[PDB]
């Protein structure tokens, strides 16, 4: 029933998901336009933890004795201590990170951080580690401008829908969004220089690999998702070997048949 | 009852070749090679037309052109030279 | 296979809808007024006459001979009056045609024997004269390739004029086309 | 061996269309039939040794086509005609979409 | 909110055993049910009533009478349907069949 | 009368010819299928115009054998008779049942029962001819005939005409 | 198939469904059909010019098809016809006609609600035909008396008159194969077919256009049968035996009975017969029509045939599962297939599959003669169809077939370009390997070939999970592609190393199990230690070992 119900549903060439009549089912498949293969369970560090560990982990104030990075983690670390033109950008960064924490505690009310996203970063870092052999005993050669402006210019490239008009633009910004939050979670001007000493070359390399892998992880127009989802649900249903409320196979029969007179009604009032 | 000829500009589709596009290109070309067709690469000792079409792709020396169709009935014409082949 | 035309329609199911041809300006549905041009232009229905068409196929065979010899690797013979044209068409046709097109050989024979002219300028003034009358291209053709010494003769051999032009004014053009004539 | 519906669904999931067309035609059923222009029926009288066709009744010997479909589908249409139902087969669409 | 409670319930069905399925599949299904105006069921009387091709709907359960009323009420078929290209034994506009191919004569000559 | 029509035609092409020679062969095959043909739809195909500029466009590959289908748009000189079309011509064959005036690629026929009563038959001469009170019509004779009937058949068109109407006959 | 025809090959983009007009049926039929006898020119082994081939389809490997001939393996069959003594309902449209006669009054024959009724335009609104008809039927089902004068949009004082005739319409309902209608005490009279036809023919044009009917393809009066289309012999086969035996199909018998009852009903007209005694055979003709199209009626009729057979109707051929659609057109028993018991081999790679020699010599692939391989091809042709890397067929460009186990030029053979060589199956070829049931995208994957002895399909261990197979005798299936683009599809789309990551769960669906999975923990210990002599063989076993101790 499922397979014969969903056959003619596939990602077309504008990442729309329509049927043999062209009526739109989704405007981007999976509400992200992303192929389910290149997706891995990561953990956005912007959500969990106290505000103490948050500021301890992401705040950089060049205008303080204890809130500025040690000039050992950067050559220019001693001749920037007190530079006020850059604290505008550092404050913009920290503001944006806090905005993430609010937005993602708003969408993910569990506070659950482990969630599946494309592009696995916490390996893409170690590839730069063993590939460029950066010892955690020399200072970086990255200006803060390269970090902040670098990531900010990176987000402009992670495309999913190429378009001109305002509509497709907002559709794109909503098509990414959740990824950029992890991107800012792992590319913080502190962790980038404190946790894993990045050079400029390794940094641009990480941006390149991120852009590439991301572009790879997009759905391929033509992919018949209707059949894929149909069998993706029908297969585990067969692997079902069956508080006393309807569950399992018969409940599923009620769901698909859409019956007014279910076995266990019941409701939950908080 | 006319033409939805999408110009070279205002080109919206992905600049990359889908695994399905690539698959049917290597397929069709390999067939044509086996149909005793002119090959546009130095074979360097190759007798399997699939492999030969693969070499034709690596050097982007295939004359084929993909017509990507859109739901409304429009079409973007892309060349196998234009399309980046990542995959 | 099957050659299709530019003015293409689709009368589904209606297997019985075809008008009958007639002399009184009733041509097939493929030969109405400004027929459809493949470029997308309501182009006027094209009609030729004798000799003129011989010139058309003549230029076509000139570009066909020259373009036919441009790729023959790995400045013009013309003039020709009457018989030195009849003999010269043959080799050109057998070089730049499949030869099997016997209809082409017969049609060229008819197009040069009953050819009313020879010069391009003459038939040009003919086209300006008859097309200046504002008549049907079929009429421009017939009056462009018949010899009617009398307005009654022209009105007889063409049941399409009649009340489209007066007899003596119709004579006015015939007295000019009688002069505009290449003597054999 | 049978190539049932589930075996079809899997190949639709892979998106391998030429393999399916191969498996449903040259690999099993397969048939060439002529169709009239007006009536989308199988009225054509194929005189292949004389290049003569005709669709009598509709009176057509100029505009007649051929198509490659599985003989099973041909028999299906002959049965639906055996229940007085005309499935007009048309080669070109007339609805933009 | 109906679609939301539906997806959530189904997710409790699949995740009851602990087996995981990527959001996009289930979400695709529930989207298919809601994207009509209400709850379109997944049965004979459910979705096979829509404007889909006569043969596509024909290949599910009721069949004969669907072709009867399709012949009576002069239905015309889009042929965009998967199952219908399957019946005609043609290249189904499916992934590999979702585009056309041509030979650009210019680039063709510019390899010699 | 002769017409000039816009025509389109689909030609399939084997993968063997997928080279720079391709654009040539197509045209060389079009002239083999189009020129010399005849059908009541658009009369006789005589000559294709402007060989130097004929449009081909790209063609799609039939998705089972590497063949490629092309749609070619062109212009051609055509000709087909009509009822009541007065045209001149010359006889080719003649006997006791009437004479056959040939015009262009088409064989027009005229019946004894259609000629004037003063004109009669003459078989006692080589070649035979129809003798009148003043005129004689044999083979090479010019006659202007008004076409009355038209018949299409396979790859040829025949017709029936008259000389009884005024302003017709030998010219 | 086969024999070129000078016709332009095309595809299908529209499929328009209509209803046959009796004029079309009587304009397409090749023969009139009068004799209800099958073959045997009165005990003469041939065919009577009456049923199955007075002109149409051919049997017994002969020509004769209105000069079409082309034998059996080319002619599609040509359609006949048979007249009717009187009009007869259609078995599936009775439910419709019952609801159409309730929307338009008899006597006159026009709609019961004009545009002055405000709920009528509300039906004429949505262009959906199948729901517009439901609306109109939901409206005029109450009007059981026709109308002529009705107050319009103004006031009930202003009476606007439409078309005349205002007789009472009955409360019609279906009984068996006929309709019932009651018009103080109501009255009853038979609603014969001739009335329904004679009244539907006078329905107005916009009424056709408003009840979902078509002007040229599907009119309501074509729901009533006037002439029956005789199917050609291919629809009703004659599976016989020996030479002097029969074996016609059930459809031939039902059609025969239809012809019998039709001859009886038509002879009862030129001869003396009462009104309510002819109709006893009229409902018999209508009956044989009904059971000929639908013999699984929900009503009392069941209609067997002599031998206790319930008669396979036409709808019984088409309804799904082992039927025309779900059993043939959506799933066939294709050629170039093989199935057998399987066993796991820990010395193969993932994508490989161990095919036995017999299958390798039995399954074939059509290669083309090309300069790149003509030495190989000729070598194979000369190895013959019994030494493993051989071939078994050669096809010329003239469409001729050349067997290799028979023939006399079995060792000669001058292969020319463009010819075809049906070779055997060799290693590293792309095949489609699967296990039923195919409830999974992963259930059919492409495999590289390796030819081996013994009669077992041999497959790698770590590929049991996406196939879900055990070695207690489970049989596996295998298909072989047939074009170059097809095997390209299999190799660049359906390859096993491609389908390691499952999109259904964003996770690899191919682990390491059992003997591999057990000992690998035993090996991965601080207590596990190997000494030299074994270590070297361990290293050599790694095929991609860099040769570094
Ligand atoms: Mg078992
Ligand atoms: Zn027809
Ligand atoms: Zn036949
Ligand atoms: Zn009435």
Numbering used by the authors:
A (entry chain A): 840 to 1081, 1092 to 1119
B (entry chain F): 69 to 155
C (entry chain D): 3 to 76, 112 to 221
D (entry chain B): 1128 to 1224
E (entry chain A): 1343 to 1454
F (entry chain G): 1 to 171
G (entry chain A): 3 to 185, 195 to 560
What did the publication describing this PDB structure actually write?
Using pulses from X-ray free-electron lasers (XFEL) with sufficiently short duration to outrun radiation damage, the structures of biological macromolecules can be obtained from nanocrystals at room temperature. The resulting method is referred to as serial femtosecond crystallography (SFX)2. In the double-flow focusing nozzle (DFFN) that we present here, an inner liquid jet is focused by a coaxial faster outer liquid jet that is itself focused by gas as in the traditional GDVN. Our DFFN system reduces sample consumption up to eight fold compared to a GDVN, can inject crystals in their native crystallization buffers, and is suitable for time-resolved mixing experiments and future high repetition rate X-ray sources such as LCLS-II.
To conclude, a new injection system for SFX experiments, referred to as a double-flow focus nozzle (DFFN), enables structural biology experiments at room temperature on samples of high biological importance as demonstrated by the first structures of RNA polymerase II and HPCD determined at non-cryogenic temperatures. The majority of these residues are in RPB2 subunit (amino acid residues 70–76, 335–345, 466–477, 717–722), with others in RPB1 (1174–1187, 1243–1254), the RPB4 N-terminus, RPB6 (69–71) and RPB8 (65–67).
